[PDB]
Structures are given as C-alpha cells and as structure tokens.
From a paper:
To investigate if loop flexibility is directly dependent on the strength of the hydrophobic anchor, we designed a mutant, in which we substituted the phenylalanine, which is the most hydrophobic amino acid on the Hoop-Woods scale, with a leucine (AtSOBER1 F65L). While the mutant crystallized in the same space group and cell dimensions, we found the loop B-factors significantly increased when compared to wild type AtSOBER1, indicating that its flexibility had improved just by changing the residue that anchors the loop inside the hydrophobic tunnel. While the catalytic efficiency was decreased in AtSOBER1 by substituting the phenylalanine anchor F65 by a leucine residue, the opposite effect was observed upon replacement of L110 by a phenylalanine residue in AtTIPSY1. We hypothesize that a more flexible lid-loop renders the surface created by L63 in AtSOBER1 less rigid and therefore less suitable for deacetylation. For pNP butyrate (C4), valerate (C5), and hexanoate (C6), we measured increased catalytic efficiencies after introducing a weaker anchor (AtSOBER1 F65L) and a decrease in AtTIPSY1 L110F. The observed differences in catalytic efficiencies for those C4–C6 chains are mostly resulting from higher or lower turnover numbers rather than significantly different substrate affinities. This suggests that the strength of the hydrophobic anchor determines the flexibility of the lid-loop and that a more flexible loop leads to a significant increase in product release. Our attempts to turn a SOBER1 protein into a TIPSY1 protein by altering the hydrophobic anchor (AtSOBER1 F65L) were a partial success. Weakening the anchor allowed the protein to hydrolyze para-nitrophenyl hexanoate, like AtTIPSY1 is able to. AtSOBER1 F65L also displayed higher affinities to longer-chain substrates and the lowest affinity to para-nitrophenyl acetate, a pattern opposite to wild type.
Residue numbers in the entry: 4 to 211
Write the structure that this text describes.
Amino acid sequence: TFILWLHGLGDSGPANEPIQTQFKSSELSNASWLFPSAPFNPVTCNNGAVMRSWFDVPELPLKVGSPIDESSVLEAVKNVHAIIDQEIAEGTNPENVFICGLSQGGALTLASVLLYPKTLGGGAVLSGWVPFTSSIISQFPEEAKKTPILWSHGTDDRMVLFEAGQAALPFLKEAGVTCEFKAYPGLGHSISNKELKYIESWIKRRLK
C-alpha cells in the first residue's frame, strides 16, 4: 500500500510525516508513506510572498465562487502524477495507491485523482475545495471516475468554508465520481485525530 500525503499552504512534508503515527492499525502497518514538499512559489493571497505552495491561491477564504487558477493546479498535478507513475512503475497496484491532503493539498488530491489515467485506491480530501471549473470534467479519464473520494470537512471552518466542501458533491455527481462526505461538527480548519481514524478505517475498507 502506498499513501501520498499532500500538505497545505506554507507547510512542508517533513512537518506532516507524524500524521502516519496516528494510523496505528495492523492493516496499515506496512504502508509506504510519502510526504513531499511543495516548491517555494509566490502566493497571491499573501501579496506575492514566497512560501511552499502547490499552486497559486488568489483569495481567502475559499468559498463558493472564490477565484482559483487552473494552469497552476495542473503544474502541481503533473508533479503528483510523476510520483504516482513511478510508484506504479515500480510494481505497486494502482488500487493500492491512496492520495490524501489538507486544504491546498486536499484540492490538489482531488485534481490529481480525477485526472489520473487509472483507478486508484482512493482520494481523501481534508478541508479542501474544488480547484477548477466544470470545463475540466470532459478530461477526467474513464478509470479515474471509479476512484472513491472521501471528503472530510469541519462545519466551523472559516478559512475554507464548509460550503466550499459541500459544493464538491454536485461537481462530483456531474463528473460521475462517487464521494462520501464526512462532516465534523464544530471542527475548524485543522485535522483531528478522530478524522484521521475515520480515514484509516475507510482505507482499510477499500483494501478489504
């Protein structure tokens, strides 16, 4: 099993590696985790300040109708796909690949899974958003639409509004993708351990 975790805006891979220690089950004990780090890019919502960032974010908070940026998301998708391609080329079954991420990394998770040519084990989005318009749906590969999505979002999030997460559901229905949406009442823009345990249980169920 291969689990790729994509950090949020400004953060890094090594800062998030301890997330794996919350996945304490026997079933996930042998998983191969990878926590890459985004390049240093200028970020528009931070007035052009440079920080680790998967793709440019024009505005906060993320909302229904907030501006986004497709060429930037696709540069990031290209790199995620290179990682997935190499893992599969080294012999991992595509259905044993899981992509997960927080916020900006959750948006990237979604884009990466939906554009990948093969069905993967799953995409787990934490407090993310849909980082493109419906114009891209025609480009989602046939097998990508079979990859299950688990979307986790805090109801009290004021950085990526809960409504931006709810908006993924009709988008994914249009796209022919199956998504479980898991709301966390009272949670804001952060990860809770219970949220991670539920993701772990979902991975276990997918593995079967």
